Amino acid sequence: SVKVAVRVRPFNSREMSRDSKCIIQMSGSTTTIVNPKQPKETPKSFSFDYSYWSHTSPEDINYASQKQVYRDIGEEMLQHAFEGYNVCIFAYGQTGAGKSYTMMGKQEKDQQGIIPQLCEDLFSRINDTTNDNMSYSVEVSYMEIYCERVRDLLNPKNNLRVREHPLLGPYVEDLSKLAVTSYNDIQDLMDSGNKPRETSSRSHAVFNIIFTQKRHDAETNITTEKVSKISLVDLAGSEKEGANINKSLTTLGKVISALAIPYRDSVLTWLLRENLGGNSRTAMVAALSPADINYDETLSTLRYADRAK
Numbered sequence: 119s120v121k122v123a124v125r126v127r128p129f130n131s132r133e134m135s136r137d138s139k140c141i142i143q144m145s146g147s148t149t150t151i152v153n154p155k156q157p158k159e160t161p162k163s164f165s166f167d168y169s170y171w172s173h174t175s176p177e178d179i180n181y182a183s184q185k186q187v188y189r190d191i192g193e194e195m196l197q198h199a200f201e202g203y204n205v206c207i208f209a210y211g212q213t214g215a216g217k218s219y220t221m222m223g224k225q226e227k228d229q230q231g232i233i234p235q236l237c238e239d240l241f242s243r244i245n246d247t248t249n250d251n252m253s254y255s256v257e258v259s260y261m262e263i264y265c266e267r268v269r270d271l272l273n274p275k276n277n278l279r280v281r282e283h284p285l286l287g288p289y290v291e292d293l294s295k296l297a298v299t300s301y302n303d304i305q306d307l308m309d310s311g312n313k314p315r316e317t318s319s320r321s322h323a324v325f326n327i328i329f330t331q332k333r334h335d336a337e338t339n340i341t342t343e344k345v346s347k348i349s350l351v352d353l354a355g356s357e358k359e360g361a362n363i364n365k366s367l368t369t370l371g372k373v374i375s376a377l378a379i380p381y382r383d384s385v386l387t388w389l390l391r392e393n394l395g396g397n398s399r400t401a402m403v404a405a406l407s408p409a410d411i412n413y414d415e416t417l418s419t420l421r422y423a424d425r426a427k
């Protein structure tokens with residue numbers, strides 16, 4: 119239950135101008151942060167399921183690639199989805215640590231993130247299915263959560279509000295749910311999505327997929343369904359606006375350790391009630407700046423990820 123990894127990125131323009139010295143090191147699954155003031159102060163140590171070293175470039179033999187990331191976490195999380203269970207992955211961290219590049223990624227030199235890959239993989243396993251008793255259905259929803267109003271990142275309007283249907287549970291009223299029938303088609307929705315995103319990387323991006331599996335039982339001749347709810351999330355840069363963000367992340371924290379009465383405590387948390395916990399495995403990638411100038415925020419992140427256990 120619950121899976122946590124951290125990923126340090128390469129220096130960015132800012133850090134580079136700031137000569138920002140690297141204060142992060144990694145040894146398997148142990149990211150050690152060094153304090154700036156005290157170059158000695160022995161690097162502080164933490165230990166996760168995964169500690170990806172992406173400080174260099176796709177060149178360095180020892181570089182955690184978007185594939186590696188997806189193959190370790192995504193891949194499995196997708197597998198469980200086929201088994202019939204809900205799945206949710208989370209990107210969390212300072213703005214610019216790497217959440218988006220990790221979830222979505224890019225295109226050239228195929229730097230596709232977890233979402234693009236996971237998708238391609240989901241459809242690849244479906245099309246190669248050679249049992250006529252198995253038919254599939256993939257419904258997608260994409261959105262943004264700001265000041266706790268849901269923005270349909272793949273549509274116009276009608277601000278949306280998340281209710282709590284009697285039995286069914288949480289849901290965003292009037293939120294588009296499009297059935298796709300191929301990777302490409304699901305890829306357009308992605309591009310259109312990250313395209314609509316303008317805003318200010320201050321809101322949570324929730325890419326949900328409702329994977330349905332229909333099995334035609336040779337005997338009895340009864341088609342039974344099996345529904346999985348995959349929710350890939352790009353959280354806010356942790357670091358009124360702050361109120362909803364802080365409350366969200368917080369509520370989320372006292373859950374991972376728990377999952378391994380806090381809930382309606384916030385929309386984001388009140389929405390993934392079917393993914394946050396109850397059951398079904400979740401995962402959490404933590405973007406980390408390798409720059410000294412971010413010591414406090416970088417450290418705070420680590421602690422947040424360390425508490426998720």
Ligand SMILES: Nc1ncnc2c1ncn2[C@@H]1O[C@H](COP(=O)(O)OP(=O)(O)O)[C@@H](O)[C@H]1O
Nearest residue numbers: 127128172212213214215216217218219220319
């Ligand atoms: N592991 C990485 N490999 C390559 N570039 C990265 C990596 N992590 C971050 N970056 C760079 O940093 C920038 C910001 O990452 P991003 O995920 O978009 O920010 P945020 O934390 O605000 O979501 C990108 O424009 C990208 O080039």
Ligand SMILES: [Mg+2]
Nearest residue numbers: 218315318319
């Ligand atoms: Mg952005």
